[PDB]
Design a protein around this nucleic acid. Structure first.
Lengths: 566, 523
DNA sequence: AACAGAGTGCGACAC
DNA sequence: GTGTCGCACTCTG
C-alpha cells in the first residue's frame, strides 16, 4: 500500500496523489512553464480561480500516459482518476470499524442549532465522510516532504527491550498489525533499538509510546515555540456558537525520511520494527507535528489550535458552517483525518484545554470541581506536591489564592524527608481552598482591541491584583503576592509598589501591544518620585524598577478612591 | 520595471540557494559535496565546478524552460510620484532640475517600487555565529491578532525573495509587534539573549540619499543562520541575511558602504543614510551618478521617499545641515535658585567659587517674598562665570587610556552636558530645543540631549568604555534587567537598546542637578 | 521506565 | 540582600 504513486515528469520523479474529487489532473507549475496552453477553464480550488489548461505526456508507476493537465499549487501531482483507468486503489480494511454513523448522529443531537440548521449540519458530515476516522488505529497521510528527525552527530546506544505489561500486549498487538498494514511499521533490522512502553488510557486500550530517552540524548531539541496553553485560553474568542475538532493520531501522519527511520527502531515479539511516521515519545515529534497544523490553519480567522485540538467560535451559525467547511477542506487535501468521537461541533458551551467555555465566560469544569473535592489529606511529600499542583491549576479564579496556598507550600521545607507535618489546622486550610474554588467565579477573555485595566491594592500582609478590560466588569484573571520577610518591612506605599511590580511583569504580556491603565490607591505618581530617601525602606535597586515604570510610555496611572483597607 | 530574482536549487539531497548569472555557462557549486545531475525548482538536468561561497551559480543555457519575470510583491509604491517630489523639493535652478529628473529616471532599477523589497550584495556571506556558547532558546507568548496580517504580509514578501525560509533550528528568539503611526503593525525581534553570546565587531548644495532595508541585502553564511531563528505561526523562520536587531548587523552594514565609497571624498554615511555636499549643482549631479552607479553595481536599492537632495537644508544624525554656554537673565527667585543648583558641582574644582557665588546668595536673602530684584550688575557677574569655566580653568586634557564619564541634563529650552575622565571636566555641550523639540515632555527633552551627548561621546572616547550619567532612570534598569521580567519594550527604548547592547558603555542615574526653570540661552 | 509546552514553588550557589 | 537555574508537582495535547 503506497497511497502515493510514483509519477515521472520531464525525466524527474515526484509523488502523485489519486484524487477522486479531481475533475482534472493538476501538476506543479515548474513543469508547464515551457509548454503552450491549449485552453482556459475555471478550476475548482479552495480560494475557484481561473487557470489555463495544457496538454502533457508523462508516466505513472512506470507506464506511459498523457492527457490534459493544469498548474498545481503544490509540489505534487493531483491525479484525475479517469486519467489512469487501469489503476484502482483498493478500500481500507483494518481490525475494528467504528460507528461513524453513530458519531454523526450523536454529534447532531448535541448540536445547539435548529432543525433546519441541523439538516445543513447532517449533510456536511455525510459529505466529508472521507475525513472522519473510520477504523481503530487509522492514520492519515500528510502531503508534506518527509522529516529527517535523525539530526544527530553521535550515535545512540541500543537498548535491550524491558518488560511490557501483559495487560497491554493484546492492545499493542492489534495496533502493530493495524499499523503494519498501512505501512506505518516495517520489519527491519537496525543499529538502534529502543524499548516499547505502553501508557494506559481510561478505556481498556493502550497507547503506542516508547522509551526514546536514549535516542533523545543524541538529537537536538527543535526550538520552535508553538504550545502555549495559557496564551490560547486567555486569548481565545468566545462568541455564541463554539466547536472543537480533534485531529486523530496526528503524529502517525507525518512521513519521515528513510535515512531517518533507523533511529526509531524497536523490538516486538522477536522481530525488530522501524517507524515510518513521527513516533510517540520522540523529543521533536511534538514540535514538528504541531508546527504543520498551526501553519495550515493560520489564515482561518478566530481559530485557536493546541497541538491537535482545534477551537473556534462565531456569532451566527451560518458563518460557523462556512468556516467549519473551510476547515474540513484544508484538512482533507493536506492528508489529515479527524476523530469525530473526540470532537464536538456547535454548542453554546464546550470544554477546551481543561476549562469550560460557557456563554458567560471561561470557568472551571465540573470534572475538575469533582477532582478537588475528592482529595484526602496527604501523607508524603509527593502527595503534598500533587495536591498543591492540582490546586495551582485554578490559581487565576480566586482573588486571594496566594494566601490560602501559602500555609500548605510552607510545609515542604519544614518537612524532612518524605514525612510531612500535617495538622488539624492544616486540614482546615485544605478545606477552605476547596470551598473557594467550588464557589469560584467565571473568568473573562482578553479583548485584543481594547486597553488593559489593572486594578491593584494591598493589605499589610499580602498584595492583591485583578485584571480587566477597559470598562470590563468581569476579570480576566486574579493574582496576589505574599510579601516575604524582606518585603514585610516596607512602608505601605512600598508594599503597594512591590505588588504593582509583580503585576506589570505579567500585564506587559497581557496587553498585546495595547495601552495599559493602572488604578491604585496612590494619589500621585510624581510625589512618589520625590519621596524622601530617609523614608523609603526598600533598597535602591527596587526603586529603579518601580520608577522605570513611570518612564514607560505604554502605561499611565490613575487614582481610584475605592476599597482601602489595613 | 522591477529587476530579476534568484531561484531555489538542490543537488544530491541538499537544499541550497541558487542565483542566475547570464555570463557563465559553467555552473558552480560548493566544493564540500564533491568528495553533475541535480534538480532545480523540481525539474532536473545535468557541467559544474566549485564555488567561492555556499551559494550556487546556474548556467542560464542549461534551463531553457525558465524565463525570469519582473519582481512581484504585494504593495507597489508610487515610484514616479516619489521621483517628482524630489524634483519639486529641490531648491535648485529650473533647467538643472529638469536635467536631474532625466538622470533620476535613468536609474529606475536603483529605486524601490515594492514594499519590503530587498537588494543583494555580491559580497561573501557573513559568518555571524561568532560566539562560543549557544544562547538558551527563548519562550514566546501569543501575538495580537490584529498585528498578524501586517507582519504576515511582510514575512510573505520576505519569503518570496528568499530572505526568510521555514527551517527548524536549535535556538529561538522572541517576536513582539508594535503599532506604526498608520493602521499597520511592525515586527520586532528581541535579540538581547542572542546578543549577549556574540562578540561585538558641508557646503551650499546638500543631499541625503537613504538606502532601503540595507541589512536585508547582506547574505549571512548558512552555518550562522540557525541563531537568527524566530517562531511565527508555529513555524520557525530563519534569516538568510543580517536581521534587524542583531548585534553586529549595523556595524557590518555601514562598514561595507564606507569601503564601497572609500575613494569618494567628503562622504558621511550613518547607519542607513548617505550624506554628500557640493559647491555647485554641476558637481552635485556628477557625484550622484558616481554614487548611484556604485550602489547598483554593489547591489543595494535606495528608497526615493526617505531621501532628500538638492536642498539648501537637509537633516542628518538628527540635526539640520544648514547653509555652508551662556543664559538669559532671571525673573523670579525660582529661576535664580535653580541657577545655584546648576553650578553647585563647581565648588569642588574651582578655587575662588565662594566669592563669585556670594552675589547670588545675598540677592536671594535680601529680597524677601518671591519677587526678586536683580541689578544689571548681577547679570554681568554671571557673564564672567560662564566665560571663566569654558576657557581653560582646571580642564584636564583627554586621557586616551582612561574611560570617559559624561553627565548630562537639560532645561526646558536648552540642554547642558559635560564630560570628565574616570578632578574637573574636559569639555562642555549646549543644545537649543527646536519648535518641535520644545513641545516635548521633559523626559523626551532629556532624551535628545543624551543622543547628542553620545555622538560627541563616541568621538571623544577614541575607543574607550563610556559611562553615561543622567536623570533618566529606566536606562539603567534596561542595562541590567533580570530575565524573569525581560519582556518586550516600547518603541523609544529600542534605539537606545541598540546603544545599550554595547557591552562597552554603561548607563547610570545619580540624581544630581535639578533645573526645572532655567532661563534659556542668549539669542 | 515516553514527549513537548504552560504554571508554580523551593533551594543551593553566584554575586 | 537580588538573581540564576536546576528540581519537584500539576494541567494540556
Amino acid at each position: 500500500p503506497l497511497l502515493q504513486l510514483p509519477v515521472e515528469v520531464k525525466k524527474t520523479e515526484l509523488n502523485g496523489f489519486w484524487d477522486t474529487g479531481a475533475q482534472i489532473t493538476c501538476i506543479p507549475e515548474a513543469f508547464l512553464k515551457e509548454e503552450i496552453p491549449i485552453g482556459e477553464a475555471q478550476i475548482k480550488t479552495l480560494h475557484t480561480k481561473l487557470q489555463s489548461v495544457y496538454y502533457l505526456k508523462f508516466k505513472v508507476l512506470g507506464r506511459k500516459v498523457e492527457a490534459e493537465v493544469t498548474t498545481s499549487p503544490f509540489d505534487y501531482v493531483i491525479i484525475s482518476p479517469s486519467d489512469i483507468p487501469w489503476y484502482k486503489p483498493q478500500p481500507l480494511e483494518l481490525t475494528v470499524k467504528l460507528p461513524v454513523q453513530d458519531f454523526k448522529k450523536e454529534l447532531i443531537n448535541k448540536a445547539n442549532i435548529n432543525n433546519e440548521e441541523k439538516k445543513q449540519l447532517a449533510k456536511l458530515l455525510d459529505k466529508y465522510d472521507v475525513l472522519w476516522q473510520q477504523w481503530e488505529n487509522q492514520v492519515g497521510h500528510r502531503k508534506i516532504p518527509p522529516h529527517n528527525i535523525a539530526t544527530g552527530t553521535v550515535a545512540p546506544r541500543p537498548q535491550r527491550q524491558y518488560h511490557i505489561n501483559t495487560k497491554a500486549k493484546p492492545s499493542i498487538q492489534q495496533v502493530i498489525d493495524d499499523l503494519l498494514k498501512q505501512g506505518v511499521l516495517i520489519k527491519q533490522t537496525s543499529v538502534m533499538n529502543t524499548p516499547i512502553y505502553p501508557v494506559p488510557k481510561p478505556d481498556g486500550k493502550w497507547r503506542m509510546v516508547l522509551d526514546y530517552r536514549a535516542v533523545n540524548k543524541t538529537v537536538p531539541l527543535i526550538g520552535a515555540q508553538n504550545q502555549h496553553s495559557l496564551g490560547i485560553l486567555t486569548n481565545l474568542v468566545r462568541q455564541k456558537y463554539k466547536s472543537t475538532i480533534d485531529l486523530s493520531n496526528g503524529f502517525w501522519a507525518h512521513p519521515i525520511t528513510k535515512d531517518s527511520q533507523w533511529i526509531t527502531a524497536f523490538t516486538w515479539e522477536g522481530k525488530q520494527h522501524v517507524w515510518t511516521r513521527l513516533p510517540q515519545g520522540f523529543l521533536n515529534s511534538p514540535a514538528l507535528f504541531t508546527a504543520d497544523v498551526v501553519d495550515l490553519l493560520k489564515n482561518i480567522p478566530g481559530i485557536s489550535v493546541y497541538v491537535d485540538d482545534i477551537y473556534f467560535s462565531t456569532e451566527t451559525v451560518s458563518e460557523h458552517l462556512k468556516i467549519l467547511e473551510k476547515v474540513f477542506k484544508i484538512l482533507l487535501e493536506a492528508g489529515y483525518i479527524v476523530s469525530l468521537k473526540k470532537s464536538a461541533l456547535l454548542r453554546y458551551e464546550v470544554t477546551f484545554l481543561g476549562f469550560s467555555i460557557t456563554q458567560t465566560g471561561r470557568g472551571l469544569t465540573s470534572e475538575f470541581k469533582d477532582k478537588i473535592q475528592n482529595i484526602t489529606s496527604p501523607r508524603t511529600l509527593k502527595e503534598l506536591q500533587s495536591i498543591l499542583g492540582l490546586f495551582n491549576f485554578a490559581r487565576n479564579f480566586v482573588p486571594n489564592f496566594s494566601e490560602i496556598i501559602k500555609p500548605l507550600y510552607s510545609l515542604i521545607s519544614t518537612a524532612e524527608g518524605n514525612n510531612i507535618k500535617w495538622t488539624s489546622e492544616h486540614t482546615r486550610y485544605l478545606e477552605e481552598i476547596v470551598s473557594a474554588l467550588n464557589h469560584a467565579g467565571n473568568l473573562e477573555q482578553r479583548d485584543n482591541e481594547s486597553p488593559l485595566v489593572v486594578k491593584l491594592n494591598a493589605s499589610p500582609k499580602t498584595g492583591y491584583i485583578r485584571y480587566y478590560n477597559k470598562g470590563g466588569q468581569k476579570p480576566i484573571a486574579y493574582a496576589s503576592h505574599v510579601f516575604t520577610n524582606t518585603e514585610l518591612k516596607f512602608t505601605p506605599l512600598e508594599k503597594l509598589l512591590v505588588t504593582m511590580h509583580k503585576a506589570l511583569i505579567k500585564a506587559i504580556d497581557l496587553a498585546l501591544g495595547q495601552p495599559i491603565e493602572v488604578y491604585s490607591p496612590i494619589i500621585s505618581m510624581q510625589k512618589l518620585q520625590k519621596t524622601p530617601l530617609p523614608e523609603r525602606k526598600a533598597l535602591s535597586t527596587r526603586w529603579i524598577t518601580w520608577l522605570s515604570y513611570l518612564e514607560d510610555p505604554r502605561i499611565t496611572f490613575y487614582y481610584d478612591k475605592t476599597l482601602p483597607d489595613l
